[PDB]
Structure formats: C-alpha cells, structure tokens
Amino acid sequence: VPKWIQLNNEIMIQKDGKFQFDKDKEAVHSYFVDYINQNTVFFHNLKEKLDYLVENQYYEEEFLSLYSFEDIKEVFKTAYAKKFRFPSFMSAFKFYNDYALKTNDKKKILERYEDRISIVALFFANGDTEKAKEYVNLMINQEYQPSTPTFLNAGRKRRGELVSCFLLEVNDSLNDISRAIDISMQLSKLGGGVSLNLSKLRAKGEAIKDVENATKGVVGVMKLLDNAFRYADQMGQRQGSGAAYLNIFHRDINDFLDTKKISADEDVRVKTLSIGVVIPDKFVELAREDKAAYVFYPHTIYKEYGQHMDEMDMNEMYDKFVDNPRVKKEKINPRKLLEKLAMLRSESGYPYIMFQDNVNKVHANNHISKVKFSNLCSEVLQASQVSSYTDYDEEDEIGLDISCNLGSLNILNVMEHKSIEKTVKLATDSLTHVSETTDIRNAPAVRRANKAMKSIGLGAMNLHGYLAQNGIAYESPEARDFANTFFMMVNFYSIQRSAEIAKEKGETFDQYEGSTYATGEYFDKYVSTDFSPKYEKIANLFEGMHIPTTEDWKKLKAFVAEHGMYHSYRLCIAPTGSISYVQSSTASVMPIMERIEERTYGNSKTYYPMPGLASNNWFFYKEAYDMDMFKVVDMIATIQQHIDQGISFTLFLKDTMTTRDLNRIDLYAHHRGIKTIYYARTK
Amino acid sequence: VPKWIQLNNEIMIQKDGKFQFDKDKEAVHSYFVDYINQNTVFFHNLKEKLDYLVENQYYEEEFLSLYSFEDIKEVFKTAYAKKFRFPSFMSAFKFYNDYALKTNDKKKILERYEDRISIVALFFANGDTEKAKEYVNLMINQEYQPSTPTFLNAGRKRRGELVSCFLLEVNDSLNDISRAIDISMQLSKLGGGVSLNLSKLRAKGEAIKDVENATKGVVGVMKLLDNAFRYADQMGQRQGSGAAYLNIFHRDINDFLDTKKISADEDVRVKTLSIGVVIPDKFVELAREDKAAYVFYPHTIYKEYGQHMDEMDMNEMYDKFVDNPRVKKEKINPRKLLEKLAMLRSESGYPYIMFQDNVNKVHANNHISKVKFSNLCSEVLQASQVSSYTDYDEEDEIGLDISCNLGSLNILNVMEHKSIEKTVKLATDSLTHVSETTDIRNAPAVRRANKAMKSIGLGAMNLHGYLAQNGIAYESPEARDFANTFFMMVNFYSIQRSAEIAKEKGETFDQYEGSTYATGEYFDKYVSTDFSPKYEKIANLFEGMHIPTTEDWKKLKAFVAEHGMYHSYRLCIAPTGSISYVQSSTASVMPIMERIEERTYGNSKTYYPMPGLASNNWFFYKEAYDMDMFKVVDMIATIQQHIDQGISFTLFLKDTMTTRDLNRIDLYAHHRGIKTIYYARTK
Amino acid sequence: DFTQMFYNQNVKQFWLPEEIALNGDLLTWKYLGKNEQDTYMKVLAGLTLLDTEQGNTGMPIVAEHVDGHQRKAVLNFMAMMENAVHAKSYSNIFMTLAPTETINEVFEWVKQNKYLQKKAQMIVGLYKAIQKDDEISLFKAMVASVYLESFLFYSGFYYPLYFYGQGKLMQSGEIINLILRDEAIHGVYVGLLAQEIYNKQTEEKKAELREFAIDLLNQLYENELEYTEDLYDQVGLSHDVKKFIRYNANKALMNLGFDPYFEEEDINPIVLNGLKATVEPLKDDDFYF
Amino acid sequence: DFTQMFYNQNVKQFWLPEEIALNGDLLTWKYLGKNEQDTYMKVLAGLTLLDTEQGNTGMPIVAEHVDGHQRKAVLNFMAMMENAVHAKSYSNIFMTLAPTETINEVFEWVKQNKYLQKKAQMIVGLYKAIQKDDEISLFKAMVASVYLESFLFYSGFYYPLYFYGQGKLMQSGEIINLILRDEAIHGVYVGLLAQEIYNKQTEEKKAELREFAIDLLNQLYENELEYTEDLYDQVGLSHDVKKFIRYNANKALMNLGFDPYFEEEDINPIVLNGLKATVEPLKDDDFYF
Numbered sequence A, B: 001v002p003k004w005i006q007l008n009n010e011i012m013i014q015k016d017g018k019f020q021f022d023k024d025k026e027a028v029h030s031y032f033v034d035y036i037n038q039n040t041v042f043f044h045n046l047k048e049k050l051d052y053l054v055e056n057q058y059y060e061e062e063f064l065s066l067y068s069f070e071d072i073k074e075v076f077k078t079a080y081a082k083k084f085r086f087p088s089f090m091s092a093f094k095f096y097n098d099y100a101l102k103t104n105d106k107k108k109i110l111e112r113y114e115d116r117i118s119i120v121a122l123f124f125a126n127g128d129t130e131k132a133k134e135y136v137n138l139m140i141n142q143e144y145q146p147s148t149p150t151f152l153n154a155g156r157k158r159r160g161e162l163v164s165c166f167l168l169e170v171n172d173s174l175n176d177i178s179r180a181i182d183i184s185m186q187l188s189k190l191g192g193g194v195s196l197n198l199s200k201l202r203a204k205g206e207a208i209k210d211v212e213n214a215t216k217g218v219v220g221v222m223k224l225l226d227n228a229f230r231y232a233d234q235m236g237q238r239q240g241s242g243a244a245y246l247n248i249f250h251r252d253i254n255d256f257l258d259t260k261k262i263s264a265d266e267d268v269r270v271k272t273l274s275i276g277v278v279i280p281d282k283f284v285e286l287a288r289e290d291k292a293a294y295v296f297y298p299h300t301i302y303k304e305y306g307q308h309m310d311e312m313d314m315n316e317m318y319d320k321f322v323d324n325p326r327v328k329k330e331k332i333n334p335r336k337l338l339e340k341l342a343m344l345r346s347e348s349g350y351p352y353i354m355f356q357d358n359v360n361k362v363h364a365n366n367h368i369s370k371v372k373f374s375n376l377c378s379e380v381l382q383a384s385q386v387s388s389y390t391d392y393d394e395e396d397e398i399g400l401d402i403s404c405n406l407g408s409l410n411i412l413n414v415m416e417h418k419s420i421e422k423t424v425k426l427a428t429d430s431l432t433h434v435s436e437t438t439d440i441r442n443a444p445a446v447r448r449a450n451k452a453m454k455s456i457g458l459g460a461m462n463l464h465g466y467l468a469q470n471g472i473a474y475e476s477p478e479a480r481d482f483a484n485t486f487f488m489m490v491n492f493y494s495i496q497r498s499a500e501i502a503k504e505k506g507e508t509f510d511q512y513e514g515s516t517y518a519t520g521e522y523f524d525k526y527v528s529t530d531f532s533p534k535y536e537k538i539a540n541l542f543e544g545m546h547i548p549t550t551e552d553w554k555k556l557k558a559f560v561a562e563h564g565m566y567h568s569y570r571l572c573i574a575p576t577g578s579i580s581y582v583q584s585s586t587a588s589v590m591p592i593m594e595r596i597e598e599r600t601y602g603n604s605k606t607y608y609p610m611p612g613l614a615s616n617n618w619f620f621y622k623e624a625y626d627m628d629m630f631k632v633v634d635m636i637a638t639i640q641q642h643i644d645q646g647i648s649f650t651l652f653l654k655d656t657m658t659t660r661d662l663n664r665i666d667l668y669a670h671h672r673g674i675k676t677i678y679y680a681r682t683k
Numbered sequence C, D: 001d002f003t004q005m006f007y008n009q010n011v012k013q014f015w016l017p018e019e020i021a022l023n024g025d026l027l028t029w030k031y032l033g034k035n036e037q038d039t040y041m042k043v044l045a046g047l048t049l050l051d052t053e054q055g056n057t058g059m060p061i062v063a064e065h066v067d068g069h070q071r072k073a074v075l076n077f078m079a080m081m082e083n084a085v086h087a088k089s090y091s092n093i094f095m096t097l098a099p100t101e102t103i104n105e106v107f108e109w110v111k112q113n114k115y116l117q118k119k120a121q122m123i124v125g126l127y128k129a130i131q132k133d134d135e136i137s138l139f140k141a142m143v144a145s146v147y148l149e150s151f152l153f154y155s156g157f158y159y160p161l162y163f164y165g166q167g168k169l170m171q172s173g174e175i176i177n178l179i180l181r182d183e184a185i186h187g188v189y190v191g192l193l194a195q196e197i198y199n200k201q202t203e204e205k206k207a208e209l210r211e212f213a214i215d216l217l218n219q220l221y222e223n224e225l226e227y228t229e230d231l232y233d234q235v236g237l238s239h240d241v242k243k244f245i246r247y248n249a250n251k252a253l254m255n256l257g258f259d260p261y262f263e264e265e266d267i268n269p270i271v272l273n274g275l276k277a278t279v280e281p282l283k284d285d286d287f288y289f
C-alpha cells in the first residue's frame, strides 16, 4: 500500500470522535512527493517540452502555431504563477489518472494541471495571448471547467471530438434507420454519447409497402442500435453508451419499456442502450382524470395527416386521433403506465422522463421545432428537424441533429471571486470556439445543426458544496433564493455574451427571427419579475457583484432585439461526472449522495470527503437520499426557470419508499415545471 | 382431413407388398376437383382477368403494354394448349401454395400454372410474341425453370427482386462496415440472400489509428450483420438469411467458427448468419505435411504490402508473410483446424467450404479479381472488387459486388425433348433479360457489377431423376459419363448464346479482353479432349442430338474470339429447393435424400415420392445417405469441370461415420477439383 | 443430452413466496359468491394435497432410483421446489383468504373426498411399488409422475387461471402461474427420463408399457370427469374444464413420447389469457488419393 | 423452536456459482507451483465427492426419516444445495483453471484414493443403515452427517482459505466461503436434530451413544490424518492443516452437544484472514399539489 493511500484511509480513523479530514491534504502532498513528481517528465525548458509533444504526435501544430513561443511561455507562466494545489487526494488522482497527458507506454506523466490548463486556454483563445491568459486565470482559479471531452482532448492530436452529447432524429424508413445506426457508430467512435429519437418510427405490426403486420417496431431498431453501440466502444476503452427516446403515446411504449425489465428475454432486452420516455401533458391529464388513454400507430397518423405523431401537439391532436377511424390505436391505462414507469425506475433507474410541455412552454425555438427528446444525460433540450436519408445516388434532405457544447461553472469558485459575469462570458466564448472548431464529416445533420444553431451548454456545479460551506441547507428556501438569483445572473450574462458575439460577428443563429428572443417574449418574466435575493444572507453572499434588475433586463432585451443572439441555446446543466473531482466540487447542481465516498481502485481503497466537509458543516452536507425529494424538485425547478435547456435531475430514493412515492415525485416535478428527470438511484 | 390428403396418404398403405404410387395421381385430381377449381377465380375472358390484375395492383402494366391483347391471348392459348397436368399432388400443392398468385386476403387463387407461365414468358420476351411463345413452350414442357424469385415475382406489382443471391465485399473500415450492414438490410428487404466477405476486416486485437488491441474482429461485424438480417426478414414472412465468409488464414478463423459452436456464449453465438470458410491450397498443403500453420492479422499485411491478405495469392505469399517481422501472425495447427471444421459440420452443417485454388485455377476472370468467397448457397463463384465507402460528403469508390440470376434446366425434360441447345439458349436469353431489367437503387456495387459483369446462373435439376428413370445408378461411371457429356453440351451452347448476344448487341462484359475467353485458354480442354459419351447406353440417351466435338469447340472458340462473350459467368448450379417440387424433379444435381419424403403441412401429413419412383426403379433411386460420398464427389467434379461458377454440393453423411470420414471427404473433394461444399447433412 | 439444459432452466426459474404480496386479493375475494369461494377453496386444497405427495414421495423416490449425479441434482432441485416453495405458497394463499377454522374444515372435506382420494392414492400406489434395480417399475412411477405434473393438476389450475384471466385474485393467480410453470418443466423432464427407459425395451415390452400408460390415463381421466362435475357444476364451468383436461392429457402423453389420445379442441379464452459425431484424428495418408 | 428460523436463513443464503466470475483467478493460478496446483485440485475433488454423497444420499435419507413438513423442507433445501450448488461449483472452478485432461485425471484419482474411499464407505454406510422408525440408527447417521459437515470438509477447506487470506485465488475463494457458510448452518441444524434423539434416551443408552460418537470421530480422524499428509506434505502444510481439523472436530462435537475432545492450538493467521420494489396504486390525490 502506497503512503498517500494510507494517509487517505487515515481519514476514516476517528480522532477525538472526529474524522481526520486534514489528513487528506497530507495525502495529496505524498501523492505528489512520492508518485506524481517521480513519474512526471521534465524538460530543460518549455520550448523543448512543446517540441517533444508536437513531434511525438501528442499535440496539434495548428493551435500552437497561432502564437509566438513568447506568448505560449507567458500563458504557461500565468498558469504556474497561481501555484495551484489540489486540496484533496482524489482531485489530483482523478486528474492524473483521467486527464493528464501520458506517454504512449502510459508510465510517465507529460502534462501537469497547469500544462493542461495552459494548452486548453491556448486552444480556446485561437491566437489571442491576452484571451489565453484570461482563460488560464479562469481555469486555474477553477471558476470554469470545460467538459471532459474538451478538457481532455483540447490541443491533442490523438483525440476524439470535443462534443460528446449527440441527439439524432430517426425517420420512419429502412434507409433512415441504417443511416442512424451508421451515425451512432461514427459518433461513438468519436467518443460521444448518442441519443436517438424513435418516436417517428412506426410501431410493431404496421404496414411496409401495404403489406400488413410487417414492421418489427422500435424494439428491433433498439436491438440494432444496441449492437451498434456495443461494437463502437471507443476503440475498446469505454463501454459504448447510447440512449433511445420514445413518446409515451407511441404504441411500442410498453415493449420499449419491456426492454429494461429483468424478466425480458435475450431477444427483447437491450443492455447498453439507455431509454427515455417523452411524456406530453396530455398523458398526465389522462392519468390524472383516470380516463383510459390510447397509444397510437405512428404510420397511420402519418398517412392520415402527412406529419409524424411526435411532430404535432398531442394536446390538440389526441381527440382527433382518437375520433379518426383511419388512425389505429390501442387502449391503455395511463395510471398503469405511470406505475410501470415508477417500477422500472425503481428496478433499474430507467426510463428517463421528459415532460414535453414543460420543455416546450418555455422553449425559445418552437418555430424551428418543438423539443421532442433529450440526450443520454437528459439535460439537452433543443429543437431538432428529422432528416430524409434517401437511397443511394439520391440527394438526402439534411435536417438538424442536436449536438451542444458542454462546460460547467464552479459556483463556489465563481461566487467567492465575485466574477459571475466574467466567468459566464469567458465560458460562453470558449464554448463558441469549441462549437465553431467542431467538424464531423460522418454526421451530416449534426454538422449542419452545429453550424446553424450554434448551440452551447453552459452548466454549473458545486451548488451543494457552495451552500454547505456557507451554512445553507440544500432544501432551505434560502438555497432556492440563491439558486434563483445566481442562475438568473448566469442567464443574463449568457444572453448578453450571445448578443455581443452576434453583434461582433454580425450573424445570429439560423431562424433566430422566429425565436422568442427576437420577439422579446423570452424576457417577459425578466422585465416584470425581480430576481434579487429575498433573504439578507443571500444578498450578503452576492455582495460585491451587480445583480441585474428589471431595468437591466429591459436593456438586455432591447440589445437582443437590435443585435440578435448568436447561440440558439446557451445553458444546460450536465451531470459533470469526473471533472467535479478535479475541480474539488460536488457533481452538478445535485445534492451530494454521500458525505465521504469509498472507492476501490485496483486492489486499494480510497476515501473522498465532499469538498470543504468538516465538523462545522457536516450537518449542512446532508446526503441526497436523506433529503425530501419535493424540495430537491423545488430547487431544480427554481434553477430550471433560468436555464433554456434542461438539467440532469437524478432522483435519490430510499429503499423504503414505493412506486407511489416515485410517481408522486415525478408528478410534482411535472407540476413544478421540471423538464427532465434523469435517474432514480435507490440507496 | 381432405380427400386429396387421404389419397396421398394411401401411397404408403402397401397393396400386395408394393407402394400405391398411382394413388398420388388420384390425389392431384382430387386436389384440383375439390380445392383448386373451386378456389380459382374465373373471368368471362382473358381481357377481364388481365384488367382486374392490372388495376388491382397485382401485375405491372408496363410489361403487358408491350403486347397487343391478341398477342397475350395467343401466348395464353399456347400455354393452355399443352394441357399440362401435375403428375404428383405435391407439385401442384407447392405451386399453388408458394408460387400461384392469390388475392390480397389470400382466400382465392388468381393464377393457374399456365397463367403464371404465360406472365413469366411475356415478361421474358419483352414485347416479342414469338419469343413469348417459345418461353411458354419451354416452361410448360418444364424444360426450363426460372428461379423462385423470378418465377414468383415476374410481372407482379407487389414483387420483390428477381435476383436470388447477392455477394458483398466488406472493406476494413467503419464506414464500409456500416454500408455493408445497410446494403444487407436493403437486399434482405428485397428478399435476396446476402453473402459478405469478412476476410478484409482486420482481426481482433488490431489497431484503429495507433491505439492497439482495439478492434472487435470479424465477430463484432458478424453480430451486427446477424442483427441486421434478423431485423430485415422479408417483412416477417421468410427469416432473414445471411452468409459470412472468412479466409482460413484470417486470425479470427477460430472465433469465426466459434460462432457456430453449440456451446458458444450469447455474446459470440450467431444464429441467423451462415458461415463459410475459404481454404486456399496452401492450408491443405500445410495440413497434409503436418507443419504448423500461421493465421494472419489482415491490417498488418495491408500496412506492409498495401494490399489485403485475401487480395493476393497465399500460395506464393505465405512464406513472405511468415518471414516478415512487420506482419503479425498466430500459430495454429492446420490439422486441428481441419478437425474443428469437420466437427462443426457434423454438429451444425457449418461452415461452407470454398477451395479457393480449385475455384481460381479454372476461373476465367482472374484478371478482374480472384474469387475470394461464395454466396449463401456456396455455388456462386465470381470476381469481386471491394468498394471504398468513404465519409459523408466524399465520393465513394464503387467496386463490384457479385449478383447473378438463377435458372435451372430440367435434365429429364430437356433430354426427353432432345432440346439441350434450344433450352440452353432460351434460358440464357431469359437470364440476360432478368439481369437487364434488374436495377437495385440501394446497392451501388451490386448495380455496377450487374451492369458490367452481366453474370447469370444457369443451373440444372433432375439429374438423379433422369438417371434413375433411365436405369443408371447415380454412382455408376455411366452416370458420370452422362453428366460429362450433358454439361459439356450445356456449356457449349451457353457460350454460343453468350457470344451470339455479344454479337447482336455489339458489347461484351466489362474487362472481357483480359479473360480466358478472349485469350482462348478457356477452350483448351475443349479443343483437345473429346467429351462424347464413352458408354453405348449414354450415347443412345444422347441420340437425336448433335454432341459437340473438338471441331465444334474450335469453331466456338473462333466465334468467341471474333465477337466476345456477353456474360462473364453463365452456369451455376443452385440447390433449387422448393421449385423442384413444381417441376416434378429431384433437387439440383444432388442425389435424392429419401425416396418418399414425409412432410407435415398444417395438421396434416403428406408423402412425396421421388419423381418417377416405382418398383422397377426403386433401387436406382438410391438415397444419398446410403451412397459413397467419394463417388458423389466424383460426379460433382465431373459436372464442375463444365460449370464456370460453383455447384451447391451438400454432403450426405451417416451418424456412424466420424469427423475423420468428413475430413477425408473434404480432402477428396479438394483433390478432385470441387470448388465449394455446401452442407454436411447427417442422417 | 438434456440434463444440463434442464438444470439451467430450473435454477433460473427460482422464486420465493414472499415476492408476491397477497393481501390485495381480498379486494376481489369479497365480491365472489359462496359457490365461487367454495370451489376455489376445494380446488386449492386439492392442489395442495397432491403437491405434498409429490414433494414427500414422488420426486424424492425418483431421485433415489435414477442413476447419474447430474440427474439426481436436477431431481433434488425439483423436490426442493415442491417442499420449500410450492407448499409454502399454497399455505400463504389459504391463510390470506380464509380464517384458520375454515382452512381446517376444507382440508377435512377434501381429505375425505372420493375423487381426490382415488387419484391421490393411485399415484402414490405406483410410487410405493418401485423396486430397487427394476427399471420397469421405475418407468411406471415416472408415468404416474408425468400424469400428475402435466395432467392431474390442471382440473385444479383451471379455476385460478380463469379468475386471473378476468382480473380477479391476481396475486394468488400470479403465484399459481409460477407454480404451474415449474410443474410443466417437471413433467417434461421426468418424461424424458421415462422415454430413456422405454427406448431400452424390446418391441413387445414397449407395446406392453404403452398399454399400461393408456390404461392408467383412462382410469385417471374417468375419475377427473367425476372430480370436475363434483366441483365445477355449481359454478357452470364443467364443459370447458373437461376440454382443458383433455388438452393437458395430450401434453402429458407427448412428454412421454406418445401420440395424443384426444382430438384437438380450442380452450376457454379467459383461461388462455390467464395462461456430436465421434472426433477421430487425421492419421495422414488421408491427404493422398 | 428453531426450524422456521433455519428455513428462513437457508433460503436467504441461496446462491449459484455463476454469480461469481472466475476468470480473475487465472493469473494467480498460473503462478502457483505444480505441487500447489496438484494439492489444490485434489483437495477440491475430495470436497466434490463428499458433497456428491451428501446431496445424493445423506440429506435426502435424513429428510425421509425426520417427521414434520417444515423440517423436511429445510433438509430438502440443504440436499439441493449439496449437489445442485456446492458439488457443481467445484466443476465451475475446475473448468476455469484446468485443462480437460487434468480434470479427468483428478476424478480418476478420487476413485482410487484409499482415504477418500474409506471415508465415503464409512459415512454412506451409516446413511444406508438407517431403519424406518428406528431413532438410534437415525442418530448414528446424523452424527456421521455432522462429522461430514463440520469436521471432514475442513482438510479440504484449509487450502482455498489459506490462499484467500494471502489475496490469491480470491474468486474461487469467494465460492468456497459461501459453501463454508452453508455447511456451518447445516452442521448446526443436523446437530440439533441429533440432540433431540439423544435426549430421549436413558443415561445408559446416552453413555453408549457418546461412545459411538467418540469412536467414530477417532476412526475418521485417524484416516483424515493420513489423507492430510498425503495431500499436504508436498506443499509443506500438513502439521498446520492437522491443527485446523482438530479445531473443527471440536466444533462438530459441540454441534452434537458434547464437550471438546482436542486441546486448543494456534491456527495459521492467514487461514483466519481467509474467513423489485413495493408497489402502490396511484390515488387521485397524488395528481394535485
């Protein structure tokens, strides 16, 4: 057992009835005195290091060639002047095991934290030394964290794509299904998580070229996609991850759900394909009134109306579908379906729940399309247009496939530096740069939507960490007040930066003129409701920072009207799995699952306390499972009212609560305006 | 139970110790006087029938519009003038259950045998009334039988494709793999059996752009193809059938074979994809000498030499592969691999065995490409060039994917009518028409190969029926002499018709100039060796027909040199599974499995005696399992010497014999020049 | 050729009574008439009593006389399911639906019932007649066992399946469906062991064993018809139950490798809704001809 | 007072070897000396034999003679574990670690090994000597069963535990620990049944039964010493294993309600280190907040 691992395991050993949290710090020192410095490759000067990394195909020549060597050296010096120290052993371990650049033999460390941050900053700035230094100060203060793809791969020649969330629309044809399989394989090859909408696909027992009972339904397509994702597994590094979304009014919805049951046969169950269910308000109304619902055959609806079932508003179309004899449908019990969803989420955490009307009643780009499905993490909610992939030697009709750009603000570090505006604007600029530098040659609709929509996702993390280190309970009304104010400022500065980029470049996102930004509707609740903190403690937390008022929001609305907005979407709160370790932050805006988490690496045990955990804030670091899920829903809705896309919202349940409690949480989330529900993790 | 069912079951009720074969005839009468005539749909005249079939989307109106109604009436009258009667109940039952056109609800019979034959003939003639009458006389006499796709689907609006088998070359890339999956689904949707050569795909543990041990090998692609064929299953009517072919020198050859082991795990086992193994002469030489062999990693060979492992001759490059340190290889025991092949064929009948050198030592189009794999029935052996399917928005390099149209001569009916020449020429014309009117819009390499190669497959059926009905034992040297003479005549007249078509159209198949037809090498054994019958009985059997001599072959060689050949490939002997029932013929050139076969249909059981089975020819209808497989190999080699493509050669084994006997049969087949071995069916 | 495959299927079907909550059945039980409740109780007791014989005698006696370690293990597993799982499940259903005094009375009645006793003692008689190292007596007992597993239970299973197919007594119906699924595989497995013995016999001995099986089936069938009328006439179902008995008799015969005895009939739709060659090395000179 | 709690404990301990992936032991196995691998294979083969007979014969025969449906259900479950779970798990281990020829050889070795044959002869002889309604013959067989469960397995268990405790062969070791956890409760349960019979006797009869138990233990012990030396001398551990079997002999005696017979000794510390959701329907009030 290594010395740093012993020093880390000494945390659980209680002295005077208290955990030895400070010992973790010592572990970090050991982890750097015994391992990191010994296995870190050192060079006589930075010029030699850069030459070795470029020549050995570690870095890219293009992004480094935009700067003189003096500017690169100045950026590296700015990164190293902070003298950044990892506060916990797990932060440094996760960085140097997951993100630090290693030799081809994987035994030496080529990149420190400062080196990786400097390289990512130089990639972000695209030739501006001052902008690169600003990015270096942003990331070394740990105010902003690029996502795992961006942070890991920026500036590296041997790399995947910087985007890892992809949403694909699948049209109801064999050509479109095969193209979707191909694109899923290509994007998993790039290292991205792929979500596919299967609602347009006709159900099982439908007609193919006017022969009856011929379609295999969406379950056969799910089997094909599951095989494709198993095959494309990042060159045998990570398990291929894919998601499939189906509307709850699709007839296959039960069989869809049956793919996640343990009792399902081998020809029914898909193991590497996550599933999500899109639930329109009509289904919730039918379940609430206990009226029996109807699941429709999509192809009959398409034949009758010329549009797909998921392309029209089910609230106004459901009665017409039911009363139409030419539309084929099957009787179901919506309450039974809700109970089945709750039971499946209890067993396996699936499916993801998308409340379609909750997403689309605040969607700014409904003119382009309504949000029909979400991503693999159930937080990307954007307009998508299906593509018509025709036969060979025939021109395809390329639509819009969602691929947003991830990046997370560290709420604790951002707010302690009183730099919400600067961090949000710099993160928006970096996300815009990464979106502009993304070029996928095997996903035509993804590339077209990236060029047109210019959608980015700016998330936040360390919400619970910040609240606990400031003596605020996550379920307290003060925490929701802080979340409201902080995320309203984040939205304000994100919109301001998007409008500034649109003014500078002279271009907005495609079909912006029809958006609620152009019409000013988006700013309605912002020009009438003041989002300043209602509690003195939160106001003192925001001291030293200008909180945008209704007049500031009116000025921003006028600015957007005059200049437009560059990004169709700006904010989405991703789970932030492993980057939260490196940043010493709690994951996403979720409450912490455990105060101290026990992990097993190799044959060794390691202990990670939550950041800033001590005896004084032990009570404020309440575990997520012990919390009331209604108050967690309230906080997530408070944040969601300022996020244009969704939030990865995992439910944290105890083994005692039943499926009725899960359904109640889901229905309260639907009532409170929650757009997506990610997971049902049972303790 | 139906009256005809009782009459057919009365065959096995012996009277005076003999089977009541004549009862079978009675059954057909019943089957027509109680079911077919009552379930048939009669019109006032042919005009109303044709109009009803045209407007109700049963028939394509284009092929019928090329004839005036008087000509169509004359063709139908020619078909009905023969007064064709089905001699066995099973012939009529199979036609009216599998090939006769029925209504949309399948409650009535719209097409008689004469109606189907007339429609197929009118489609074949393409506006020529005299040619349509010739086709009608050829098919109503049952001298020639179009394949099941062509016979069933010719002239139908709801038809599929007329091509039975498709062969795809899969290049070593994710884009090519995805395109192969798409094309396999498209062609299975069209109803054709798809064969894919996986020998170019790099083995398991190869590098995908400098990251090693990343590839899943051919087994992952096999699983993808298996799921694709499961999904595309002819709209749920016929199970999707696919074939995978791998060279025996591929490193994955064991894992490949492990897909068919009955103890294979679900993550490896493949159940809807047939497997074939391509064995060069080098492997047989290594096994014979007991020298340990080496299987190779295709990607290392491609990197070192710039060509795929199956793209070059292993007999001359195996030592270079072994001595090359930059080529990666694994040690295997070739005798152990042969024993594994024999055990697998005993257990499940797989893999198909393709003796590559036996195919390519007489292959006439080696300049275009060597034959690297076979079809799903292991009888199509043609040159194929792999396609380079590139990224989206990039032009693809379209290669040649094999596809040929099947058609079988009924040997008994052809020789009874003394019309080898006329039947062969008319069948060649019909297959040329089927190739010309075939246009597949989702398989580009298949379309290009169909347009360029113009390859057709003219098979033969009722070899054993003709031999047994003429008092010739199938294993006798007289039977092999008859096969030699008959198939030399078939080859002569097929080459003559191909050259005549090339002369009349002024065009040959692509790259004909480099073929052995153009250089005259193909005719060598035909201009030096006489293939006239060596037995007086066979010569009497061939009386009334001009058997080509060496002078006729020299004249044909000069004619080909002057005019060329329209078809790259002309003769391939398919299994002819279910259409042999309608023709009252034994399946293909294979010996009969059983004298009387008991088949269960619905809740009833039926007995089909072999065509012409009686007391005097009971022992001439020797069952295949009771026959010496070495003499069957001799027969198949004798036929194969006159067939440019392969023959679907099924091995018929007894349970008592061991895997060593199967290996001996395989090695004798390789020694005798057998190109492919189809199945190892054990009694 | 089959024991490891059946081992797999058996162990993967493992379940426990506690998994199904029974209390929610009281919400439909209270709405049944007296005759329906009476028939259900009597049927349930019939199944319970027969299954106890199978757990205490039928499976263990066959496991004792069958040779082969793997077969003994599968048979032990089946005996375990009878005694540890099925018996507890039947008891649980009873305790949920009836008070203690009612359970005791129903079992007293069914214990004295002529048609239940006739079949129970006929089966037990054949188990008691097995002689050491006599495969004929073992075969006869296996036939009896298959008839119990695949045939005699089904006059009883009918009623819970009938309710289950209507949305009534769903929790106990789920339990019964799991039990029935176990008995089906038990019947198929014991059937294969019986066919193994049958196939080792001469043609005359085979004909004699066939006559035994058909004669036994006839005796049991005629008693089943009486058993059926005795229980189901009061709820008007006997005609349909009789069709279900014959259909399951045919399955039992097929398990023993015999032809169906009864003509094919359709079943009540509500009940339906409820429901290696020798490896020889190459010796060289096999490559030369 | 105890059967129900043993029933619950046995069924809650249910497991299958397939739950444990064994490919993780491949390297630590490869790294052992030929002597170590030989002893390990033979040790597990000796265990397989014991479980084969405990499952085929011992547990079913005791089940037959013990009165009470619940007692029989526990004993039937234990029997199933012996041959359907325990004996089979060893084959899972063998099939992972060893080539077929080595597996074939070790099973041939059990047939010809004189100590393993002697211990099987003695234990199975006592099982087959049980006479219906004769409680003394039953007691003698239960003593034999406790000695198999709580004493005889331990010369075998030592070695997997010895490796597990050093962080070697830990997946195989996990299987063995599950088997050991089962045998411990099996030995206690059968011990309690034996004590029931013993407690019915006169003082004179009790004195004879203690003589039987101690004479049998000594006879088995002397044979186990020779078996232990035969297996462990080549790996240098015979003296250590002997201390372990004496320790467990005392536990077997205690399971029978008797005083310890061997003096306490220090055992190798390595070996000591080797040791659906509930568903409610949705109310109309759950849709409003």
Ligand SMILES: Nc1ncnc2c1ncn2[C@@H]1O[C@H](COP(=O)(O)OP(=O)(O)OP(=O)(O)O)[C@@H](O)[C@H]1O
Residues within 6 Å of the ligand: A028, A029, A032, A033, A037, A084, A085, A086, A087, A092
């Ligand atoms: N907690 C830590 N986080 C990150 N790096 C660390 C940490 N502890 C030590 N290091 C690394 O080890 C070096 C030694 O740091 P130490 O605590 O011994 O003193 P120092 O005054 O920071 O040293 P130096 O002269 O290297 O700057 C640091 O410069 C840094 O590179």
Ligand SMILES: Nc1ncnc2c1ncn2[C@@H]1O[C@H](COP(=O)(O)OP(=O)(O)OP(=O)(O)O)[C@@H](O)[C@H]1O
Residues within 6 Å of the ligand: B028, B029, B032, B033, B037, B084, B085, B086, B087, B092
């Ligand atoms: N074996 C058969 N094959 C094909 N069609 C048959 C067969 N048997 C009967 N039919 C059909 O059923 C009709 C019944 O007539 P059948 O053969 O009994 O003699 P028919 O009334 O004297 O006239 P004909 O033989 O001249 O048609 C036939 O005309 C024919 O259309």
Ligand SMILES: Cc1cn([C@H]2C[C@H](O)[C@@H](COP(=O)(O)OP(=O)(O)OP(=O)(O)O)O2)c(=O)[nH]c1=O
Residues within 6 Å of the ligand: A189, A231, A232, A233, A234, A235, A236, B171, B172, B173, B174, B175, B177, B201, B202, B207, B208, B209, B210, B214, B215, B216, B217, B220
């Ligand atoms: C992407 C991917 C490829 N492969 C295998 C199958 C293909 O035959 C083979 C080639 O993939 P390619 O698509 O050719 O990958 P590449 O072009 O980026 O890499 P290279 O330059 O070396 O050609 O890699 C996998 O096994 N799994 C995968 O996920």
Ligand SMILES: [Mg+2]
Residues within 6 Å of the ligand: A172, A173, A174
């Ligand atoms: Mg379409």
Ligand SMILES: [Mg+2]
Residues within 6 Å of the ligand: B172, B173, B174
């Ligand atoms: Mg490539």
Ligand SMILES: [Mn+2]
Residues within 6 Å of the ligand: C051, C054, C081, C082, C086, C179, C183
């Ligand atoms: Mn039972």
Ligand SMILES: [Mn+2]
Residues within 6 Å of the ligand: C054, C082, C149, C182, C183, C186
């Ligand atoms: Mn049973």
Ligand SMILES: [Mn+2]
Residues within 6 Å of the ligand: D051, D054, D081, D082, D086, D087, D179, D182, D183
């Ligand atoms: Mn045991």
Ligand SMILES: [Mn+2]
Residues within 6 Å of the ligand: D054, D078, D082, D149, D182, D183, D186, D187
């Ligand atoms: Mn035990």
